[PDB]
Design a protein around this ligand. Structure first.
Ligand SMILES: *[C@@H]1O[C@H](CO[C@@H]2O[C@@H](C)[C@@H](O)[C@@H](O)[C@@H]2O)[C@@H](O[C@@H]2O[C@H](CO)[C@@H](O)[C@H](O)[C@H]2NC(C)=O)[C@H](O[C@@H]2O[C@@H](C)[C@@H](O)[C@@H](O)[C@@H]2O)[C@H]1NC(C)=O
Ligand SMILES: *[C@@H]1O[C@H](CO)[C@@H](O[C@@H]2O[C@H](CO)[C@@H](O[C@@H]3O[C@H](CO)[C@@H](O)[C@H](O)[C@@H]3O)[C@H](O)[C@H]2NC(C)=O)[C@H](O)[C@H]1NC(C)=O
Ligand SMILES: *[C@@H]1O[C@H](CO)[C@@H](O[C@@H]2O[C@H](CO)[C@@H](O)[C@H](O)[C@H]2NC(C)=O)[C@H](O)[C@H]1NC(C)=O
Lengths: 313, 346
């Protein structure tokens, strides 16, 4: 068989550790795990070792609750590990994951995994992305993952993470382009060290963040989407520069004040804008795509005026 | 009969009280929604006659909305649903205000089905399927051929633009089967979802059968999509997978199997990871993983303007591509692939 004997043992042991769920019926010990018959299993055809390097465990409908099996550590060539959509997957992210020294893409999402995001992830230097969104993880953000040199994005939305964003989160590499931690309980200020990032996408909405967020703006940035709605941010919006690439700006339900920046007129691709429920004042800049928007994009501010709103006096 | 609706004013009463509803073909007034979002469990709605819509020049307006559990929306012989597209088309599509989503299928669960609808002249995107599960859409004809020509507002360009047939997001176990789409953009576009099946489609005039563009959205995971036994003709692309530059996400287990192509203008097959604001940059990034993609018996002829194949993956973001029985031929521009190897199948 193409399948490596230890990989096969590890897969069947993982299946066992998950209670032998019927959804993994295709994992038959009598069949070659490298033939595409085994649901969610792919082997390395690029190096032609055919070691299992891509594992997808999704929607398994476990009959009882099970933790993440530590037998995952016996697939040492995993490059991609997706564990998602499993209500009866429970317990913390286990240190066995730290033995996957070739892991590039890691997803543990839409489960009941709990506990803290572990700092041992900082040891997996090959990591490109981490997605731990929509579980029940708690505690604070692990500061050490800022040292990961290949990391391009983190997706931590929808958990119970608290505390402040570490100052170390300004130290991600220039490869780091995506940061989403929305729907948590983050408090405090966005660190000034974020001046050192150049994010295509940032989503810190629905937290308890306070203060200035100007450090996420800049005409020099290559930024597509800025999502900061439903915080208690407060700063003078009229002073910020805007990336030429910006297509989405969502600042709804904060305490941002000042006038809208005239640079909004020069944004060719701005297709989504919501600055409603803030403390903005003055004439809406006339030009660009600003007049395409519904009045509800600008509603509930302090003293805004101008099309699409009634004209200024 | 409160369940037989002959004018818009009788719709709400029927939706509130009736499990079997008949719409007899009336005009929905401006700013008013054909609101089937409150359908009772196990309800059936049958379209009869010709349903029309007054002009509502509003980007945010959604003319038809559907939601419920174990519901059936269907059409009887001779029925027509006209979307008033001629009143909006201006050559520019989603870029003059036009309802962006004609039919929104939201939170529809429990083995629901939409069958045998005859739809013509819709403004921009047709079906937007979202937050749904165990949904079958079969036997539809979406005919926007009247938008192919220019009109009084589009200058030289086709009047209709961005007229996606079926957009799917944040849904699981959705089957699109035996539907005909004559339009000007994606026949089907999946930006997120799991266990999606797209079978026996006939797609003409548009941009093909597409995953993406993935990344930067609220949901950026596509897992398990099958495009099977379908035709793509007179379209910009045949099979297409796109991910957005700088984004993170996952496209896994997508199969294009038994796809027949005729007169494709740009790409027989197109897989690329460099999209920034609806245009290619030439610099793919590696935050979106693309793995277990199969092209099995994608065959036919593309136009001389086309490249049979185009693959532009980021560094290490692509894995497990399988090619079997393909025969995409006719392209006059040399194909270009950087994964699995530097050479294409054709
Ligand atoms: C409307 O239908 C919902 C559909 O879920 C159904 O569940 C089974 C009963 C079965 O018919 C299946 O085919 C459907 O998909 C009902 O919700 C479900 O209710 C059952 C009650 O046993 C419950 O076990 C399910 O978890 C629940 N599903 C969901 C998604 O909520 C509705 O039932 C109402 O809501 C329930 C929460 C409960 O209060 C029930 O007694 C209510 O009638 C159906 N509503 C009505 C008005 O019939
Ligand atoms: C962890 O596991 C639990 C239990 O298996 C999951 O609980 C489920 O959570 C969802 C969302 O809160 C509940 O949905 C609700 O269902 C009712 C009908 O029962 C509906 O009327 C509501 O509108 C809503 O849709 C679901 O009931 C609930 N299941 C049970 C048995 O309580 C949970 O989602 C898993 N994940 C996490 C992160 O907790
Ligand atoms: C789903 O909805 C359908 C209605 O479209 C239900 O089917 C009806 O069930 C009643 C009662 O058994 C029959 O008298 C009708 O003839 C059925 N109609 C059709 C078209 O078959 C069906 O029972 C529902 N399913 C579930 C699981 O609730």
């Amino acid at each position: 068989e193409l399948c490596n004997p230890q990989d096969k043992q590890a897969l069947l042991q993982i299946k066992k550790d998950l209670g032998n769920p019927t959804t993994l019926s295709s994992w038959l010990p009598t069949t070659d795990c490298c033939n595409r018959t085994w649901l969610g299993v792919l082997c390395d055809t690029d190096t032609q070792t055919y070691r299992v390097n891509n594992l997808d465990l999704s929607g398994l409908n476990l009959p009882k609750p099970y933790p993440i099996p530590s037998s995952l550590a016996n697939l040492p060539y995993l490059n991609f590990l997706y564990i998602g959509g499993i209500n009866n997957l429970v317990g913390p992210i286990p240190p066995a994951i730290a033995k996957l020294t070739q892991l590039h893409y890691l997803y543990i999402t839409h489960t009941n995994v709990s506990g803290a995001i572990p700092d041992f992830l900082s040891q997996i230097k090959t990591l490109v992305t981490l997605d731990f969104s929509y579980n029940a993880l708690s505690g604070t953000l692990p500061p050490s993952i800022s040292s990961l040199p290949n990391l391009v994005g983190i997706t931590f939305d929808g958990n119970r993470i608290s505390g402040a964003i570490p100052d170390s989160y300004g130290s991600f590499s220039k490869l780091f382009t995506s940061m989403t931690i929305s729907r948590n309980r983050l408090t405090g200020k966005i660190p000034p060290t974020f001046a050192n990032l150049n994010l295509a996408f940032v989503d810190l909405s629905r937290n308890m963040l306070e203060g200035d967020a100007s450090v996420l703006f800049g005409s020099d940035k290559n930024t597509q989407k800025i999502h900061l709605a439903k915080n208690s941010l407060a700063f003078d919006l009229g002073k910020v520069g805007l990336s030429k690439n910006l297509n989405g700006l969502d600042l709804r339900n904060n305490r941002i004040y000042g006038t809208l920046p005239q640079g909004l007129t020069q944004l060719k691709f701005l297709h989504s804008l919501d600055v409603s429920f803030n403390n903005l004042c003055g004439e809406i800049p006339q030009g660009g795509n600003l007049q395409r928007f519904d009045v509800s994009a600008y509603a509930n501010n302090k003293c805004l005026c101008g099309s699409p709103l009634p004209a200024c006096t | 009969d409160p369940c037989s609706v002959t004018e818009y004013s009788g719709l709400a009463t029927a939706v509130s009280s009736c499990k079997n509803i008949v719409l007899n073909g009336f005009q929905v007034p401006t700013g008013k929604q054909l609101d089937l979002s409150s359908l009772q469990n196990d309800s059936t709605v049958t379209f009869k006659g010709t349903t029309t819509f007054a002009t509502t020049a509003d980007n945010d307006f959604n003319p038809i909305v559907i939601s419920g559990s174990n519901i059936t929306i269907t059409g009887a012989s001779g029925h027509v649903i006209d979307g008033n597209g001629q009143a909006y088309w201006d050559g520019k599509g989603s870029n003059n205000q036009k309802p962006d989503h004609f039919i929104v299928v939201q939170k529809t669960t429990g083995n629901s089905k939409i069958t045998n609808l005859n739809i013509q002249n819709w403004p921009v995107h047709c079906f937007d399927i979202t937050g749904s599960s165990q949904l079958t859409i079969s036997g539809l004809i979406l005919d926007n051929r009247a938008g192919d020509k220019p009109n009084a507002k589009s200058g030289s360009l086709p009047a209709a633009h961005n007229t996606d047939g079926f957009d799917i997001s944040s849904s699981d176990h959705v089957t699109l089967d035996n539907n005909h789409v004559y339009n000007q953009d994606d026949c089907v576009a999946v930006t997120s979802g799991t266990n999606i099946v797209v079978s026996n489609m006939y797609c003409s005039g548009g941009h093909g059968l597409s995953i993406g563009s993935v990344g930067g959205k609220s949901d950026n995971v596509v897992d398990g999509v099958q495009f099977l036994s379908s035709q793509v003709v007179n379209s910009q692309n045949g099979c297409r997978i796109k991910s957005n530059s700088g984004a993170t996400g996952t496209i896994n287990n997508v199969t294009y199997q038994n796809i027949a192509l005729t007169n494709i203008s740009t790409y027989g097959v197109d897989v690329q990871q460099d999209y920034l604001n609806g245009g290619p940059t030439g610099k793919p990034t590696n935050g979106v993983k693309i793995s277990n993609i199969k092209f099995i018996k994608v065959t036919g002829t593309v136009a001389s303007s086309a490249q049979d194949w185009f693959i532009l993956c980021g560094d290490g973001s692509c894995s497990g591509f399988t090619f079997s029985g393909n025969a995409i031929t006719g392209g006059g521009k040399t194909s270009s692939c950087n994964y699995p190897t530097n050479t294409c199948p054709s």
